[PDB]
From Swiss-Prot, chain A:
Gene that this polypeptide is encoded by: rplP
Database matches in InterPro entries: Ribosomal_uL16, Ribosomal_uL16_bact-type, Ribosomal_uL16_CS, Ribosomal_uL16_dom, Ribosomal_uL16_sf
UniProt keyword annotations, A-Z: Ribonucleoprotein, Ribosomal protein, RNA-binding, rRNA-binding, tRNA-binding
CC annotations in GO: cytosolic large ribosomal subunit
PANTHER family assigned to the protein according to its UniProt record, in alphabetical order: 50S/60S RIBOSOMAL PROTEIN L16, LARGE RIBOSOMAL SUBUNIT PROTEIN UL16M
Name of the protein in question: Large ribosomal subunit protein uL16
Alphabetical list of HAMAP family matching this protein: Ribosomal_uL16
Function: Binds 23S rRNA and is also seen to make contacts with the A and possibly P site tRNAs.
Any one GO biological process: translation
Domain of life of the organism encoding this protein: Bacteria
GO molecular function: rRNA binding; structural constituent of ribosome; tRNA binding
Species this protein is from: Pseudomonas aeruginosa (strain ATCC 15692 / DSM 22644 / CIP 104116 / JCM 14847 / LMG 12228 / 1C / PRS 101 / PAO1)
Subunit structure, interactors included: Part of the 50S ribosomal subunit.
Curated annotation (Swiss-Prot), chain B:
Gene3D superfamilies in the record: 3.30.420.100
Name listed for the protein in its UniProt record: Large ribosomal subunit protein uL18
Gene Ontology biological process terms in this record: translation
NCBIfam families linked to this entry: L18_bact
Role of this protein: This is one of the proteins that bind and probably mediate the attachment of the 5S RNA into the large ribosomal subunit, where it forms part of the central protuberance.
Quaternary structure and partners: Part of the 50S ribosomal subunit; part of the 5S rRNA/L5/L18/L25 subcomplex. Contacts the 5S and 23S rRNAs.
Organism: Pseudomonas aeruginosa (strain ATCC 15692 / DSM 22644 / CIP 104116 / JCM 14847 / LMG 12228 / 1C / PRS 101 / PAO1)
Swiss-Prot record, chain C:
Subunit and partners: Part of the 50S ribosomal subunit.
Source organism superkingdom: Bacteria
Stated role: Binds the 23S rRNA.
Keyword hit for Protease: no
Record gene name: rpmE
Cofactor note: Binds 1 zinc ion per subunit.
Protein name as annotated: Large ribosomal subunit protein bL31
Cofactor section: Zn(2+)
Keywords, comma-separated and alphabetical: Metal-binding, Ribonucleoprotein, Ribosomal protein, RNA-binding, rRNA-binding, Zinc
UniProt family annotation: Belongs to the bacterial ribosomal protein bL31 family. Type A subfamily.
Curated annotation (Swiss-Prot), chain E:
One Pfam family of this chain: Ribosomal_L5
Stated role: This is one of the proteins that bind and probably mediate the attachment of the 5S RNA into the large ribosomal subunit, where it forms part of the central protuberance. In the 70S ribosome it contacts protein S13 of the 30S subunit (bridge B1b), connecting the 2 subunits; this bridge is implicated in subunit movement. Contacts the P site tRNA; the 5S rRNA and some of its associated proteins might help stabilize positioning of ribosome-bound tRNAs.
Keywords annotated in UniProt: Ribonucleoprotein, Ribosomal protein, RNA-binding, rRNA-binding, tRNA-binding
GO MF annotations, alphabetized: RNA binding; rRNA binding; structural constituent of ribosome; tRNA binding
SUBUNIT field: Part of the 50S ribosomal subunit; part of the 5S rRNA/L5/L18/L25 subcomplex. Contacts the 5S rRNA and the P site tRNA. Forms a bridge to the 30S subunit in the 70S ribosome.
Membrane spanning residue stretches: none
One of the GO biological process terms: translation
Family the UniProt entry places it in: Belongs to the universal ribosomal protein uL5 family.
Gene responsible for this protein: rplE
Organism: Pseudomonas aeruginosa (strain ATCC 15692 / DSM 22644 / CIP 104116 / JCM 14847 / LMG 12228 / 1C / PRS 101 / PAO1)
Protein name: Large ribosomal subunit protein uL5
Gene Ontology cellular component list: cytosolic large ribosomal subunit
RNA sequence: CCUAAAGAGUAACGGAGGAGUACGAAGGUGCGCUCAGACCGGUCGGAAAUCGGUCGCAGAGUAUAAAGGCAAAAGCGCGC
RNA sequence: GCUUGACGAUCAUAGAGCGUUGGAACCACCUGAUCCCUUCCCGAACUCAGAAGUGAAACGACGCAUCGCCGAUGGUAGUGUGGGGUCUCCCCAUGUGAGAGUAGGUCAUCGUCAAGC
């Protein structure tokens, strides 16, 4: 479960998630990547659970990159608690995801073996995903 | 050099006050051989009157001591009058007001113009 | 140099037992007799 | 909750903009520190307030070294 | 004195030993500063004037006390506390001190075959160390407090330490 | 064959460009370089995308037929939709016989199965960069820089300075005092 | 200080910190000077004291929170 | 018309780095501390009296884009007004329009006065 070692502030506002990803949308390191097509946010329990499913399938050589870091704290107000009286305590960490963002990368394996490995990871994530290779530009 | 760049910073406070007030400025410059004096009009753009030990009546050889500055200081006062200037400010340009520059100023006071 | 805050500083003389005299102005106020100098030191000559 | 505090707002900012007619003694900019520096015909208060010493027009020019911003008064 | 010795023959010989072209670029020695860092006297304050009183005799010039630039409690000091004294010697005073150092006191300290020639910084300045002050004259052995470690520094207009060593090869420095 | 057909574009802006992609199936483009003013053109989407699956698309010179005129250009930059990936805008750099030009050239790794660090010590290859920035006259622009890793011991690092470029080709990054690693051999992950 | 939507203003048992003093010099003026830090050499201290040199330009400082300022330094020293 | 010095306009397209180069005059270094003045010590700095030396350093001039700094066109993001949708978000008509990146540029341009050439 990824989270920052320390933060300047404990809490954050909900904010909004708009636009597309013109930054972080290319295959920078590996040769095949899993891209995001819908927007949403990954909760650092899905990111871990999709990494376990991906490396277990290959389990022979290869290298794997994670390109998403969950660094936005979210809170929940405990049960049977009225409205108000402060802001709730931090529960888990999430990463904001925009269409076009690259999530995982891999190399050192076959082109086909990458497809079964990313299909196992894509089933644990709450958004639509796509498979892309690396182009010169 | 460090010596010259430190002095040019010593001269900034007085030169930036004479512009806020917008007054005529009498600027003195000293070197190891000669001493100079200028009258700067109102904002730095123009020079009205000037004198130094380089003119063809002080080229004699004792051009770098106290009594060489006295002749220059009272010489610019004569030339200042022809320009119809009076009530100027003195600008030591960062040099200490003690020696040659003080003799050049003290001649200008008796030379006719008032600070 | 300031005035009246430093020790008196004077020419004096120095003599070494090796038959050596060197002029050196200092603050002894009294000539002194030496025993070893650069003319007679072992590790200045090669011992 | 251990947070509910704030302070009254001080109403700082540019009072007269560029091209406007000023009278002597008018207050031009209210500041903390010197975000605008005093130019021609402009004085500085003891809390970094820019006021007018002459009459004319607000200028709002940036010039010189250090890349400062100057408020001055020019003839109307 | 050594001042005459320098400009009469040291300069012309050193001009050719380095293939120098201009007489202005020949290396020269500018100032000598000694100091002595008194880690003690934090709880005494009484040896400071003893340390001061010692150092006019050695140099013929009044020293001045230096204070702590910072607190740092590991050494149990506070900012603005007297930590050491220093002197600066220039022109004729340093030359006569230099003669008084080469052979009045240096040969007779206790020991040593010489001085190391690797004690040069990158810009041709040499600094050495003195364990016991009593190596100097005008401080007799029967009226002193605990022995204290004076320090010596040389500042030269030498661009690098190669010719700075050559200059200190003149003045006949005992280099090993 | 590296041929493109383009027509002169007169209507500019966001509203006019969004119409080209939506209705006509075209793509806006720019032709700058040489000593001439930039010219705005448009070209078919299915034709620019057909040229882009050649390996040496960006490392080879193209003859862009604009209307009835012809000229020699090279793909400089390329804009793509972040999610869908199709090309949205492309700009060409004109080619002059006496003028240096920079380009991105892919790397071919050869005889990997012959690598010493793999058969003997059981290592693994990891390409770090698959392209380089070059600077050469257009007469000797290479299609690909061939990097050889037959004689690479386990744990060896291959830098820019270790490979060979053709006649009159510079590696740019190497010239700027920064020779970043190309590939390596490392022990298996686990 | 943020919320606060690039003039001002703007709420919640919204998110974060401080105050209920200090100073006869820590005020005025004239004159003078630049920091933190890194590295090299140097007697005991030694990663870090005092010293010399090079680099650096504000990463220092500002009686006291944070924001906005600071070369005519608003920072540091001395005389009156 | 050129060189030097002083004062300004303008604050990197004007800066940094590298190389060459100037001493007849100016400038700097320079010689000395009697005298004016000075150092919480010291003629280092400040000051004074000068004329044997040297352009070594500093400074000025002339070169190079290596770093820095400027920087299009085109496209993209955002956005006021009116209208839509599958409405946590986007699309259409109209007006507006960056930031970053690319082609490329830059080793400045002026005014007054004084001595010379
Ligand atoms: Mg909310
Ligand atoms: Mg972004
Ligand atoms: Mg001042
Ligand atoms: Mg609150
Ligand atoms: Mg609060
Ligand atoms: Mg409020
Ligand atoms: Mg006031
Ligand atoms: Mg529109
Ligand atoms: Mg508003
Ligand atoms: Mg507001
Ligand atoms: Mg209300
Ligand atoms: Mg409280
Ligand atoms: Mg204060
Ligand atoms: Mg130090
Ligand atoms: Mg200043
Ligand atoms: Mg001198
Ligand atoms: Mg545009
Ligand atoms: Mg636009
Ligand atoms: Mg732009
Ligand atoms: Zn002897």
């Amino acid at each position: 479960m990824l989270q920052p070692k320390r933060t300047k502030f404990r809490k954050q506002m909900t904010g909004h998630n708009r636009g597309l990803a013109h930054r972080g949308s290319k295959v920078s390191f590996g040769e095949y990547a899993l891209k995001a097509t819908s927007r949403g946010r990954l909760t650092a329990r899905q990111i871990e659970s999709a990494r376990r499913a991906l490396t277990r399938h290959v389990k022979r050589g290869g290298k794997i990159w994670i390109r998403v870091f969950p660094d936005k704290p979210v809170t929940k107000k405990p049960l049977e608690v009225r409205m108000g009286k402060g802001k709730g305590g931090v529960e888990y960490w999430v990463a904001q995801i925009q269409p076009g963002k690259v999530l995982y990368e891999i190399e050192g394996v076959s082109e086909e073996l990458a497809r079964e490995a990313f299909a196992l990871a894509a089933a644990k994530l709450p958004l639509a995903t796509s498979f892309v290779k690396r182009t010169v530009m | 050099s460090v010596k010259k760049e430190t002095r040019l910073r010593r001269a900034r406070k007085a030169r930036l006050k004479m512009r806020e007030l917008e007054t005529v400025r009498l600027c003195v410059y000293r070197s190891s051989q000669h001493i100079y004096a200028q009258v700067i009009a109102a904002d730095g753009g123009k020079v009205l009157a000037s004198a130094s030990t380089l003119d063809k009546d002080l080229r004699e050889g004792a051009t770098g001591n106290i009594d060489a500055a006295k002749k220059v200081g009272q010489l610019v006062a004569e030339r200042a009058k022809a320009a119809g200037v009076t009530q100027v400010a003195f600008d030591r340009s960062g040099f200490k007001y003690h020696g040659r520059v003080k003799a050049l100023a003290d001649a200008a006071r008796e030379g006719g113009l008032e600070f | 140099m300031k005035a009246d805050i430093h020790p008196t500083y004077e020419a004096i003389e120095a003599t070494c037992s090796c038959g050596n005299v060197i002029k050196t102005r200092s603050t002894l106020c009294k000539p002194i007799h030496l025993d070893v100098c650069s003319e007679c030191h072992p590790f200045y000559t090669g011992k | 909750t251990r947070n509910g505090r704030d302070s009254e707002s001080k109403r700082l900012g540019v009072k007269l903009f560029g091209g406007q007619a000023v009278k002597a003694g008018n207050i031009l900019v209210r500041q903390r520190g010197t975000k605008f520096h005093a130019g021609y015909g402009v004085g500085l208060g003891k809390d970094h307030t820019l006021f007018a010493k002459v009459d004319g027009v607000v200028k709002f020019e940036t010039k010189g070294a250090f890349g400062r911003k100057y408020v001055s008064i020019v003839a109307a | 004195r050594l001042k005459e010795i320098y400009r009469k023959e040291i300069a012309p010989k050193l001009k050719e030993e380095l293939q120098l072209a201009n007489v202005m670029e020949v290396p020269r020695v500018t100032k000598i500063t000694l100091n002595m860092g008194l880690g003690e006297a934090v709880g005494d304050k009484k040896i400071i004037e003893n340390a001061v009183a010692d150092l006019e005799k050695i140099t013929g010039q009044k020293p001045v006390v230096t204070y702590a630039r910072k607190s740092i409690a590991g050494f149990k000091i506070r900012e603005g506390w007297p930590i050491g004294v220093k002197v600066t010697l220039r022109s004729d005073r340093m030359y006569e001190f230099l003669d008084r150092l080469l052979s009045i006191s240096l040969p007779r300290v206790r020991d040593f075959r010489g001085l190391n020639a690797k004690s040069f910084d990158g810009r041709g300045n040499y600094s050495m160390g003195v364990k016991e002050q009593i190596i100097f004259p005008e401080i007799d052995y029967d009226k002193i407090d605990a022995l204290r470690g004076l320090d010596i520094t040389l500042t030269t207009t030498a661009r690098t330490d190669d010719e700075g060593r050559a200059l200190l090869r003149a003045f006949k420095f005992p280099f090993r | 064959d590296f041929i493109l057909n383009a027509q002169v574009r007169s209507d500019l802006g966001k509203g006019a460009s969004r119409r080209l992609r939506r209705n006509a199936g075209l793509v806006p483009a720019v032709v700058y370089g040489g000593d001439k003013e930039p010219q705005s053109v448009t070209l078919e989407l299915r034709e620019i995308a057909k040229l882009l699956e050649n390996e040496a698309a960006f490392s080879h010179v193209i003859a862009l037929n604009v209307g009835g005129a012809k000229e020699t250009v090279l793909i400089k930059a390329l804009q793509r939709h972040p999610a869908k990936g199709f090309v949205m805008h492309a700009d060409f750099l004109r080619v002059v016989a006496d003028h240096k030009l920079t380009a991105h050239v892919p790397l071919h790794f050869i005889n990997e199965e012959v690598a010493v660090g793999v058969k003997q010590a059981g290592g693994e290859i990891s390409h770090t960069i698959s392209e380089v920035e070059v600077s050469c006259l257009p007469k000797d622009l290479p299609e690909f820089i061939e990097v050889d890793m037959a004689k690479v011991e386990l744990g060896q690092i291959v830098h820019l300075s270790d490979l060979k470029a053709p006649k009159g080709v510079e590696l740019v990054q190497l010239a700027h005092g920064n020779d970043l690693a190309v590939a390596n051999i490392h022990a298996s992950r686990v």
